Structure formats: structure tokens, C-alpha cells
Amino acid sequence: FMYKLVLVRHGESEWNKENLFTGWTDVKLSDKGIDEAVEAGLLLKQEGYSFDIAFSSLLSRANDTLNIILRELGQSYISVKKTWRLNERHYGALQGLNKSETAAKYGEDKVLIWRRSYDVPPMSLDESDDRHPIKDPRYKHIPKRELPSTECLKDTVARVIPYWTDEIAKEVLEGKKVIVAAHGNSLRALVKYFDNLSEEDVLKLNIPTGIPLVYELDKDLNPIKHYYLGDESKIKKAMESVAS
Amino acid sequence: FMYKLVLVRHGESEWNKENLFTGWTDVKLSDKGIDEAVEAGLLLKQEGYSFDIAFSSLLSRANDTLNIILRELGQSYISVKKTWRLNERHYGALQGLNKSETAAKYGEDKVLIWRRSYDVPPMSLDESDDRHPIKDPRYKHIPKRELPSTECLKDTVARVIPYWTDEIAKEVLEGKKVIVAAHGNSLRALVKYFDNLSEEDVLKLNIPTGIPLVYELDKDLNPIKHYYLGDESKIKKAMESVASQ
């Protein structure tokens, strides 16, 4: 191989217990989440990984995960860049609700379509809703028309990949060692891209929280292989938790 | 006023107990240091401070302090920029030694000159020494000739101010709310600049660890006033601790 890229999904948040749709809601890591980040950092150290540049989203839980990892590596001084383009998928008007409140409000049929679809977004937020991204000043540098009121996975993939093209790939091609600390659906977008997954396969992909995913890439950034770091049992446990 | 700039010095490191000269040595914060950062963040939150951009050094202890502060503010997503120009003063061949080892090795006279001088650096590191910055890959983007083998305070000031000019001041002038999390001597450089301190006064300036220092600035970035945040007693205790080191 020529290059290594490391991807990591943040751990449990304060809303995973009640199983709320999170999306762009800026919720904090839980203490379990914090501990998962510590272990992901210890794992990277044990395996000899170090980095020159780090990327994350504009959401706290990803950034806190990244900071904990870099601290464990003794690399809290490296260049860090953040972008909305690595944000979790926007879940529209589902944000803040549990699955049963969602069924009750939008109906069993529409909820079944939304869960199984690649390209049908859930009900959108109105711009007047307090949850809408336009009301958060961290997004004021982004034209309002491009801030999502909702996303299907297809929308998420379409706004992730340009960041891969313009920033992440650029750094890899300059020989920098990159880590990306992001979210389930934004990492799904990247895995779909690298391994040319079908819509069906990306919808069933369950990326384990807190386990580094390493891609080995050739001179042209085609994947040679990938693998999660650490023991098969830790990975299985984390993968079942994401499924269930 | 027109603008507010916030400066903060990191808290205790793992070498402050034994009182070792640290400089560019990349030592970690102690648990007391971590706690000082937590309190500095809680203090800023209590007082309604928020930020658009943050600056720090290339040293872990400053960056860890900054990350802790931003986490307490719920602002771990903001833009952060790091530069060697905000590094602590380089202490040359004193790095890793205590005061008595330094006296014994270099003598009482030279140690007295070094402590009182603005412009006489301590004994320099050879490029072959393991402590020399050229051996650390975090500095590989900097021409070797500009990486210090030692610094006097005058050298430190001379390499801090350009970062103020090119980056920090630029952001302040664009209306961004800036925080700088750095070190004793790099902040001394900035205080010397803002308040036009004499060489004597900057040498006696004790910036307390972990207490935010706020400058109110006019349209042209001239200081109107400054103040530390929080209770007089926390400040006094922190200032006496710095006098002690």
C-alpha cells in the first residue's frame, strides 16, 4: 500500500439511552461515550498510529471524541479542521423524538418508508422551528439554502463527498496521515464511496462506535483493504450495539 | 470599547512540582492543571463569554487547556489554530534541570545574569542534543535556522508579535471573538506589547495560571483596559504561586 486513512465514529451520546433521533442536535457524549473515545485512543497508540491532520464535524460529540483520542496519543497539537459536511445525517422533524412518538405523529407507513429509503427524506423542519440549523450561529457562514431542513441518506452522501474531494483526499495525497472523527451516516457515506456499495448495502452497514476503521489506499486512493483495529469480540459487541 | 480579546495561561504541568525548567519540553498538564482549565472554562461560561476562533501553541499543555475550556463552554466545534510562535520561551540547555543543578553546572554568576536579563539567553542546546527542536517532527515546516537553541525574553517577544500582527489581530479586526491559550512568557510578550511595558516591568510581570485575562480594545486595537476574571482571592493565590515558581 501507499497510504493509510483512519476513520472513527464517536461513542454513545446522552440521547442513545432513550433512543432519540439525534441528527444535528448538538448533544453531549455520555460517560460511556467518553470511555469509548479513551479506548479508541489507547488502541491507536498500542498499534503505533500517529497523525499529521485531523478532521471532524461541527458537532460537539465528534469533536470531544477527537480531542480525547489525540490527547491519548500525545498529539493534541496537530492541525484540526472542522466542517458541517461531516455532520451526522439531518433527521428533520424527527429530531428529539423517540420511535413511538414518531409512529404516532407521522404514522406507521411513512415511518417504514423513511427507515428503508435511501432517497426519501423524513418530514422537514420549518425555518421557524427552534431546531432548524439556520438558528444556530455556528452555521452562519453557509448559505441558508444549503442548510438542510431534513436529509435522506442520499442527500448526506452528496454533501460529504465534496469534502473528501477538496480536503481529506488532498491531504492524503500530500502524504499526511489523516484521521477523521465523525458520525454514523457521514462515515457510511465515505465507506459507500470507497467500496462502491449499493444503496442496499450502505443501508445495512452498521459502523461500530469507537473502533478505528483503517483504509489502506494505493497511489490513486483506490482502497486495497480495510480493517477495524482491536479484538474481534470488542468489534462484535460494538456492532451488535449499533444494530440493537 | 469595540473589541474584547481573552488570554489564558495554562495551569500546572507535571514538572511544576519539582520546579524543572520546561520551555519547549512537551510535558503534560497535572491533574491540578486539568482542574484549573475546568475552572477557567466555568468562569468564562458564568460571565457570558463565547468565542469564534481560538489560538494556541504547538505544546500539548496549552492545547489541552484550550480544549477543556471550550468543552466547558459547549464550543468544542470552533476554529482552532496552532503555532510555534505562541510556544513558551525556550530555556535552552536548562530544559529538564532544577535550579540547583543549573547553578552547579553553569555557576551562580551566569544563573543570576540569565534570570535578570531581557536580552542574554541561557546556554544553548547543541543540534545533537535530544532536546533540540529540530529533532521533533512537529516543527519540520519551520526553517531550521529559525528554530531556537535557546531564547532570552527578547527573542521570545520578537517571534510572538508577528503572529499577533498576521493572525490574531486580523481576526479581531474582522469582528471575531478570540481566545488565546498559551504560556507564561508568550503571554508576557503580548502584555508587554499591549501596555508598552519596560524591560524591567515585563521581567517582574507574574501572569496567574488558569485565570482569563480580558483586554478591551478600541477600533484600532489600542487597549482601553484589561482585567482578570473571577474572585480577588483566586487571583491572589494564583499570582503568589507564580511568584513562587
From Swiss-Prot, chain A:
Single GO cellular component term: cytosol
Pathway: Carbohydrate degradation; glycolysis; pyruvate from D-glyceraldehyde 3-phosphate: step 3/5
EC number: 5.4.2.11
Gene Ontology MF terms in the entry: phosphoglycerate mutase activity
EC category: isomerase
Domain of life: Bacteria
Binding site for substrate: 9-16, 22-23, 61, 88-91, 99, 115-116, 184-185
Reaction equations catalysed: (2R)-2-phosphoglycerate = (2R)-3-phosphoglycerate
Gene Ontology biological-process entries: gluconeogenesis; glycolytic process
Residue positions of the active site: H10 (tele-phosphohistidine intermediate), E88 (proton donor/acceptor)
Keywords: Gluconeogenesis, Glycolysis, Isomerase
Listed Pfam families: His_Phos_1 (PF00300)
Annotated site residue numbers, Transition state stabilizer: H183
Family: Belongs to the phosphoglycerate mutase family. BPG-dependent PGAM subfamily.
HAMAP family reported for this sequence: PGAM_GpmA (MF_01039)
Function text: Catalyzes the interconversion of 2-phosphoglycerate and 3-phosphoglycerate.
Name of the protein in its database record: 2,3-bisphosphoglycerate-dependent phosphoglycerate mutase
Organism: Borreliella burgdorferi (strain ATCC 35210 / DSM 4680 / CIP 102532 / B31)
Gene name of the record: gpmA
